[PDB]
Amino acid sequence: KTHVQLSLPVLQVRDVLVRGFGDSVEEVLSEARQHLKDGTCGLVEVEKGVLPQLEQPYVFIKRSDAAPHGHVMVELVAELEGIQYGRSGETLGVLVPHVGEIPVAYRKVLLRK
């Protein structure tokens, strides 16, 4: 399938133990996709002061369309030193590894895989 229905645990930035996916744009997009497939991916909602608390490169989920079965269609865009790799809509949040942090909510998305 080109798209997969996921329910992503929404984490508070100060709970996150592993604050990024790796060290290159290509690695973080790779690792993000692997963690989404394995159900080991969390979502941090972006507000003032959140991104400086996480590690670059960043992996964002961005709205790809204007919502089958309650699931917003999203795609991955990475960012390193102010340059983005991909072009998409509004940010729903920044992806991070999930290693058992307690979420505050779940975000239903349809991920272009």
CATH number for 65: 2.30.30
CB 32, CB 66: distance < 8 Å: no
Name the method of structure determination. X-ray
Extract the tokens encoding 61: 């989920």
- Phi-psi domain of 98 (left: phi exceeds 0; alpha: psi -120 through 50; beta: other): beta
Non-local (6+) Cβ contacts of 38 within 8 A are none
* Among candidate residues 50, 55, 56, 68, the one with its CA nearest the CA of residue 111: 68
* Entry resolution (Å): 1.7
CB 20, CB 28: distance < 8 Å: yes
Extract the tokens encoding 66: 């204007």
- Residue 38: count other Cβ atoms within 10 Å of its Cβ: 9
Write out the residue range of the structural domain in which residue 99 sits. Answer: 3-112
Extract the tokens encoding 57: 């490169």
Q: What's the CA gap between 33 and 11, in Å, rounded?
A: 18
Q: What's the CA gap between 60 and 62, in Å, rounded?
A: 6
CB 22, CB 28: distance < 8 Å: yes
* Total domain count, the chain: 1
Report CA 66 to chain centroid distance, whole Å. 19
For the chain, how far is it from start to end, CA to CA, in angstroms?
8
Coil, strand or helix at 33: helix
